[PDB]
């Protein structure tokens, strides 16, 4: 039996699937702890930038969970991703502790840009600004990648890096009431929000787990960006970003919510 997690229904991904849009032909790089093999995931390739780790296997769980919110297969098991036919690439930039360096994150972004990824999901943050990060987001954006990044989980009124930079689409987290989740960082630079509380998805060891975080909200927006790219193959990263903001359901003040809740039905109309 396949279940549809509440967040997938909340962003109205099933409505876009009924229009025949599933993210087919869209390449999505998940820059995280890796992605492990799972019966409800199909991983196309990837690269590791973690010192002394040649593989893209997930030693943490986080990367595999994020991957399942974007693209868990539409079948008779597990869950269902926002864009279940997207081509997933595992770009391992964080180690087993969930930590990484600005150098591995920046190498991952350069790989995404050099390998023609359409969307790069960064469910990660650095507490401090980094010129290296800004430059790598800008480089990947110039090559055509839409970078989507988590605002962070401190609950503060400023968002983390690289989400704060102009060329990153910053994603905050909502709960089941469509309120901002208490941990979700907000403030200047916030673009959009998506479900980030009790998000069930794929996990290592062929299982499933429920997690909370702006890292869970970010893949919902990366997934809806892949549905828009399938509908509109000639659109640029900037066009997709603006269309996602323009069609989001407003939830209140933009300092707290950006443009509001991502809406895959309205974005694929
Ligand atoms: Ca499934």
Swiss-Prot record:
GO terms for biological process: proteolysis. It is an enzyme of class 3 (hydrolase). One of its GO terms (cellular component) is extracellular region. Binds 2 calcium ions per subunit. Ca(2+) 1 binds at residues 2, 40, 73, 75, 77, 79. Keywords: Calcium, Hydrolase, Metal-binding, Protease, Secreted, Serine protease, Signal. It is found in: Secreted. The active site is at 32 (charge relay system), 62 (charge relay system), 215 (charge relay system). Ca(2+) 2 binds at residues 163, 165, 168, 191. GO terms for molecular function: metal ion binding; serine-type endopeptidase activity. Optimum temperature is 55 degrees Celsius. CaC1(2) markedly shifts the optimum temperature to 70 degrees Celsius. Optimum pH is 12.3. Alkaline serine protease that cleaves various substrates, including N-succinyl-Ala-Ala-Pro-Phe-pNA, N-succinyl-Ala-Ala-Pro-MetpNA, oxidized insulin B chain, casein, hemoglobin and scleroproteins, such as keratin, alpha-keratin and elastin. Monomer. This is M-protease. It comes from Shouchella clausii (strain KSM-K16). The chain holds residues 112 to 380 of 380 of the full protein.
